[PDB]
Amino acid sequence: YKRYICSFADCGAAYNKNWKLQAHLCKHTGEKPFPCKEEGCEKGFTSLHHLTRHSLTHTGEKNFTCDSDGCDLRFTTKANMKKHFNRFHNIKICVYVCHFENCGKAFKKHNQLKVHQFSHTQQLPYECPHEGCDKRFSLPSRLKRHEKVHAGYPCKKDDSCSFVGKTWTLYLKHVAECH
DNA sequence: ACGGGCCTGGTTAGTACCTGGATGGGAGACC
DNA sequence: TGGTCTCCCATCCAGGTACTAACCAGGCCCG
Ligand SMILES: [Zn+2]
Ligand SMILES: [Zn+2]
Ligand SMILES: [Zn+2]
Ligand SMILES: [Zn+2]
Ligand SMILES: [Zn+2]
Ligand SMILES: [Zn+2]
């Protein structure tokens, strides 16, 4: 079963490895059986391994990498990095993928991919929807701003005439008053 | 020659959304 | 059964995203 058990009353914890209890104990006490070896740092631990994992940080090492094809960006921990992959490469979730090869990426939504793909072009994604113009954009919000132009009641009198039309009442005049 | 709008390329706060980075707590493979 | 040195996860929290709404100032256009 679980021999080792908390020494304090009420806790009730119990472990099948003295060390497990031993780390739990330090919770009650507040010991630093494994402190760091550098000033400014007062970080403590309860395992000769929870100190090491902290070491690579006092420097900024990246001994672990993202087990994936395309991305080389290494990570600080394995099980940790495992996150990235699943949040990027591993399909099932990020089904839609840019198979343009080399770029090798993916997205949760189809449209999301479509956009990206444009990065392999010369044009921008979110472009102005209307005849003529053709003006394209990146940030949709910015496009929505330009839209304010093609929105009114332009008359039809050959390319010659090409004024828009704020509103019917004002649009009519353009025809009557002018034309 | 002008002044006020209408836009627009260039920027800049204002944010809800994520993402690693760093841990806390322990199973576990072996011996 | 218990050490030892490993290998995972489920999270918590600060730095960085991906855009959006709000500013700014110069180019045109027209009464
Ligand atoms: Zn306890
Ligand atoms: Zn330290
Ligand atoms: Zn990757
Ligand atoms: Zn791509
Ligand atoms: Zn347009
Ligand atoms: Zn007209």
Coordinates of C-alpha atoms (C1' of nucleotides) and ligand atoms in Angstrom, one line a residue:
Chain A
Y1 CA 0.0 0.0 0.0
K2 CA 1.5 3.3 1.1
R3 CA 3.7 3.0 4.2
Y4 CA 5.1 6.6 4.5
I5 CA 2.7 9.1 5.8
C6 CA 2.6 12.8 6.9
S7 CA 4.0 13.5 10.3
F8 CA 1.6 16.2 11.1
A9 CA -1.9 15.4 12.3
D10 CA -4.9 16.2 10.1
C11 CA -3.0 16.2 6.8
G12 CA -3.5 12.5 6.1
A13 CA -1.2 12.4 3.2
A14 CA 0.6 9.2 2.5
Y15 CA 3.2 8.0 0.0
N16 CA 4.8 4.7 -1.2
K17 CA 8.2 6.2 -1.2
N18 CA 9.8 8.0 1.9
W19 CA 11.1 10.7 -0.5
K20 CA 7.6 11.5 -1.7
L21 CA 6.5 12.1 1.9
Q22 CA 9.8 13.9 2.4
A23 CA 9.0 16.4 -0.3
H24 CA 5.5 16.7 1.1
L25 CA 6.9 17.4 4.6
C26 CA 9.0 20.3 3.3
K27 CA 5.6 21.8 2.3
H28 CA 4.6 21.8 6.0
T29 CA 8.1 22.9 7.2
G30 CA 9.3 25.2 4.4
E31 CA 12.7 23.9 3.8
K32 CA 15.1 24.5 0.9
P33 CA 16.8 21.1 0.6
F34 CA 17.8 22.3 -2.9
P35 CA 18.5 26.0 -3.3
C36 CA 20.2 27.7 -6.3
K37 CA 23.9 28.7 -6.4
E38 CA 23.8 32.4 -7.4
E39 CA 22.9 35.6 -5.7
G40 CA 19.6 37.4 -6.3
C41 CA 18.0 34.0 -6.5
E42 CA 16.2 32.7 -3.4
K43 CA 14.4 29.9 -5.3
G44 CA 14.1 26.7 -3.3
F45 CA 13.1 23.1 -4.1
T46 CA 12.6 19.5 -2.8
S47 CA 14.4 17.4 -5.4
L48 CA 18.0 17.5 -6.8
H49 CA 16.2 17.5 -10.1
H50 CA 13.9 20.4 -9.5
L51 CA 17.1 22.4 -9.0
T52 CA 18.7 21.4 -12.2
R53 CA 15.6 22.3 -14.3
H54 CA 16.0 25.7 -12.7
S55 CA 19.6 25.9 -13.6
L56 CA 19.2 26.0 -17.4
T57 CA 17.1 29.1 -16.6
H58 CA 19.8 31.2 -14.8
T59 CA 21.4 31.1 -18.2
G60 CA 18.7 30.7 -20.8
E61 CA 19.7 27.3 -22.3
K62 CA 17.6 25.4 -24.8
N63 CA 18.8 21.8 -24.8
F64 CA 15.3 20.6 -25.9
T65 CA 13.8 21.0 -29.3
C66 CA 10.4 20.8 -31.1
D67 CA 10.2 17.3 -32.4
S68 CA 8.8 18.4 -35.7
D69 CA 9.5 18.9 -39.4
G70 CA 9.8 22.6 -40.5
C71 CA 10.2 24.3 -37.1
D72 CA 13.6 24.2 -35.4
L73 CA 12.9 26.5 -32.6
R74 CA 14.1 24.6 -29.5
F75 CA 12.4 24.6 -26.1
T76 CA 13.4 24.6 -22.4
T77 CA 11.7 21.3 -21.6
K78 CA 10.4 18.2 -23.3
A79 CA 6.9 17.5 -22.0
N80 CA 6.8 21.3 -22.2
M81 CA 7.7 21.6 -25.8
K82 CA 5.3 18.7 -26.4
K83 CA 2.7 21.5 -26.0
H84 CA 3.9 23.5 -29.0
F85 CA 3.7 20.6 -31.5
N86 CA 0.2 19.7 -30.5
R87 CA -0.7 23.4 -30.6
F88 CA 0.8 23.6 -34.1
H89 CA 1.9 20.5 -36.1
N90 CA 0.0 17.5 -34.7
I91 CA -3.1 17.4 -36.9
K92 CA -6.5 16.2 -35.7
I93 CA -7.0 19.8 -34.5
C94 CA -4.9 21.8 -36.9
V95 CA -6.3 19.9 -39.9
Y96 CA -6.2 22.6 -42.6
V97 CA -2.6 22.7 -43.7
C98 CA -0.5 24.8 -46.2
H99 CA 1.0 21.9 -48.2
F100 CA 3.0 24.4 -50.3
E101 CA 5.9 22.5 -48.7
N102 CA 8.9 24.1 -47.1
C103 CA 6.7 26.6 -45.3
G104 CA 4.9 23.7 -43.7
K105 CA 2.3 25.1 -41.4
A106 CA -1.3 24.6 -40.3
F107 CA -4.5 26.2 -38.9
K108 CA -7.6 25.3 -37.0
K109 CA -9.9 26.9 -39.6
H110 CA -9.9 26.7 -43.4
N111 CA -10.1 30.4 -44.0
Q112 CA -7.2 30.8 -41.6
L113 CA -5.1 28.8 -44.0
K114 CA -6.4 30.6 -47.1
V115 CA -5.1 33.9 -45.6
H116 CA -1.6 32.6 -44.8
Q117 CA -1.3 31.1 -48.3
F118 CA -1.4 34.7 -49.5
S119 CA 1.9 35.1 -47.8
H120 CA 3.2 33.0 -50.6
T121 CA 2.0 35.5 -53.1
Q122 CA 2.5 39.2 -54.1
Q123 CA -1.0 40.3 -53.1
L124 CA -2.4 40.9 -49.6
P125 CA -5.3 38.9 -48.1
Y126 CA -8.3 41.0 -47.1
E127 CA -9.0 42.9 -50.3
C128 CA -11.7 45.4 -51.3
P129 CA -14.9 43.7 -52.4
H130 CA -16.4 45.6 -55.4
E131 CA -15.9 46.2 -59.1
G132 CA -12.9 48.2 -60.1
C133 CA -10.7 49.4 -57.2
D134 CA -9.0 46.1 -56.6
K135 CA -7.3 47.8 -53.7
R136 CA -6.3 45.0 -51.3
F137 CA -5.5 45.1 -47.6
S138 CA -3.9 43.2 -44.7
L139 CA -5.8 44.3 -41.5
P140 CA -9.6 43.8 -42.2
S141 CA -10.4 46.7 -40.0
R142 CA -8.4 49.0 -42.3
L143 CA -10.2 47.7 -45.3
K144 CA -13.6 48.3 -43.7
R145 CA -12.4 51.9 -43.4
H146 CA -11.6 52.3 -47.1
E147 CA -15.1 50.8 -47.9
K148 CA -16.6 54.1 -46.8
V149 CA -15.9 55.3 -50.4
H150 CA -17.9 52.8 -52.5
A151 CA -21.1 53.4 -50.6
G152 CA -23.8 55.7 -51.7
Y153 CA -25.6 56.1 -55.1
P154 CA -23.3 56.8 -58.0
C155 CA -25.0 57.7 -61.2
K156 CA -24.6 55.9 -64.5
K157 CA -23.5 58.3 -67.2
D158 CA -20.4 56.7 -68.9
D159 CA -17.0 56.6 -67.2
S160 CA -17.2 60.3 -68.0
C161 CA -19.4 60.8 -65.0
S162 CA -18.3 58.7 -62.1
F163 CA -19.4 60.5 -58.9
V164 CA -20.7 58.4 -56.0
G165 CA -23.7 59.6 -54.1
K166 CA -23.9 60.2 -50.4
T167 CA -27.7 59.7 -50.4
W168 CA -30.7 59.4 -52.8
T169 CA -32.0 62.9 -52.0
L170 CA -28.5 64.2 -52.9
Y171 CA -28.1 61.5 -55.6
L172 CA -31.2 62.5 -57.4
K173 CA -30.0 66.1 -57.7
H174 CA -26.7 64.9 -59.3
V175 CA -28.9 63.7 -62.1
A176 CA -31.4 66.5 -62.2
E177 CA -29.4 69.5 -61.0
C178 CA -26.6 68.3 -63.3
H179 CA -26.2 65.6 -65.9
Chain B
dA1 C1' -5.3 82.3 -54.1
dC2 C1' -8.1 79.7 -50.2
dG3 C1' -10.4 76.6 -46.2
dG4 C1' -12.9 72.6 -45.2
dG5 C1' -13.9 68.0 -46.1
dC6 C1' -12.7 63.4 -47.7
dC7 C1' -9.3 60.0 -47.8
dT8 C1' -5.3 57.7 -46.9
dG9 C1' -0.3 56.1 -45.7
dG10 C1' 1.9 56.1 -41.4
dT11 C1' 1.4 55.6 -36.3
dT12 C1' -0.2 54.7 -31.9
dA13 C1' -3.0 53.4 -27.6
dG14 C1' -6.5 49.8 -26.3
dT15 C1' -7.2 44.8 -25.8
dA16 C1' -9.0 39.8 -25.6
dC17 C1' -6.2 36.0 -26.9
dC18 C1' -2.2 32.9 -26.6
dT19 C1' 2.1 31.1 -25.6
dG20 C1' 6.0 29.6 -23.7
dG21 C1' 8.6 29.6 -19.3
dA22 C1' 8.8 27.6 -15.0
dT23 C1' 6.7 24.8 -11.5
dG24 C1' 4.4 21.9 -8.2
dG25 C1' 3.7 16.8 -7.3
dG26 C1' 4.7 12.9 -8.2
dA27 C1' 4.3 8.2 -11.1
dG28 C1' 8.0 5.2 -13.0
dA29 C1' 11.8 2.3 -15.0
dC30 C1' 15.5 -0.2 -12.9
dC31 C1' 18.3 -2.2 -9.5
Chain C
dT1 C1' 9.2 -3.2 -0.8
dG2 C1' 12.5 1.4 -1.2
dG3 C1' 16.4 4.6 -3.3
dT4 C1' 17.9 7.1 -7.8
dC5 C1' 17.7 9.4 -11.5
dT6 C1' 13.9 10.1 -15.1
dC7 C1' 9.7 11.5 -17.5
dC8 C1' 5.2 13.4 -17.4
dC9 C1' 1.2 16.6 -16.9
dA10 C1' -1.9 20.2 -15.4
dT11 C1' -1.2 24.6 -14.4
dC12 C1' -0.2 29.7 -13.2
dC13 C1' 1.7 34.0 -14.9
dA14 C1' 4.5 37.4 -17.5
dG15 C1' 5.8 38.8 -22.4
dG16 C1' 4.2 38.8 -27.2
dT17 C1' 0.2 38.3 -30.6
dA18 C1' -3.1 39.8 -34.1
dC19 C1' -6.1 43.4 -34.9
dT20 C1' -9.1 47.4 -33.9
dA21 C1' -10.3 52.0 -32.8
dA22 C1' -8.4 56.5 -32.5
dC23 C1' -4.8 60.0 -34.0
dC24 C1' -2.1 62.8 -37.4
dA25 C1' -0.8 65.3 -41.3
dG26 C1' -0.2 65.8 -46.5
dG27 C1' -2.7 65.3 -51.3
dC28 C1' -6.7 66.3 -53.8
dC29 C1' -11.0 68.6 -55.0
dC30 C1' -14.5 72.3 -55.2
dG31 C1' -17.7 76.3 -53.9
Ligands
ZN1 ZN 0.9 16.9 5.5
ZN2 ZN 18.6 30.5 -8.9
ZN3 ZN 7.5 23.3 -34.4
ZN4 ZN 2.2 28.3 -46.2
ZN5 ZN -12.3 49.8 -52.9
ZN6 ZN -24.0 61.5 -62.8

